């Protein structure tokens, strides 16, 4: 599914993302926007290290989910990477929360550093009722 901006904003808020571990809703929106364009079935294969990024947050298979084909990979979210390709984003949000409990927090995603950090992200939730 490809979410529309505000519907995704409310969907993430209902799922407990607003302020999760100090991360604003606007930050999560900026992340999903730049990672997949709000597309839950988005995928990116990384030929260099044999891993794949899955879903709306483009979560990587080397450490977070299991796809059975990434060498020496772990599964910290304890989910099949398939769960990150569903229209319903509950599992993806559970995994994204798991990612941020680690030291780096929201910085785990390089794209967040490139397009969201120290940027004006208000535009992502304006008019959405969140």
Curated annotation (Swiss-Prot):
SUPFAM superfamilies: Lysozyme-like. It catalyses: Hydrolysis of (1->4)-beta-linkages between N-acetylmuramic acid and N-acetyl-D-glucosamine residues in a peptidoglycan and between N-acetyl-D-glucosamine residues in chitodextrins. The active site is at residues 35, 53. GO terms for molecular function: identical protein binding; lysozyme activity. Disulfide bonds join 6-128, 30-116, 65-81, 77-95. The keyword RNA-binding does not apply. CDD domains: LYZ_C. Lysozymes have primarily a bacteriolytic function; those in tissues and body fluids are associated with the monocyte-macrophage system and enhance the activity of immunoagents. Monomer. This is Lysozyme C. It comes from Homo sapiens. The lineage of its organism: Eukaryota, Metazoa, Chordata, Craniata, Vertebrata. The gene is LYZ.
């Amino acid at each position: 599914a490809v979410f529309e901006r505000c519907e995704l904003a409310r969907t993430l808020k209902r799922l407990g993302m607003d302020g999760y571990r100090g991360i604003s809703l606007a930050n999560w929106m900026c992340l999903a926007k730049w990672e997949s364009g709000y597309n839950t079935r988005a995928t990116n294969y990384n030929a260099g290290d044999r891993s794949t990024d899955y879903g709306i947050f483009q979560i990587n298979s080397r450490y977070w989910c299991n796809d059975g084909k990434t060498p020496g990979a772990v599964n910290a979210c304890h989910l099949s990477c398939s769960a990150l390709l569903q229209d319903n984003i509950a599992d993806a949000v559970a995994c994204a929360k798991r990612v941020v409990r680690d030291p780096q927090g929201i910085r785990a995603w390089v794209a967040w550093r490139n397009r969201c950090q120290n940027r004006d992200v208000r535009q992502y939730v304006q008019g959405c009722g969140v």
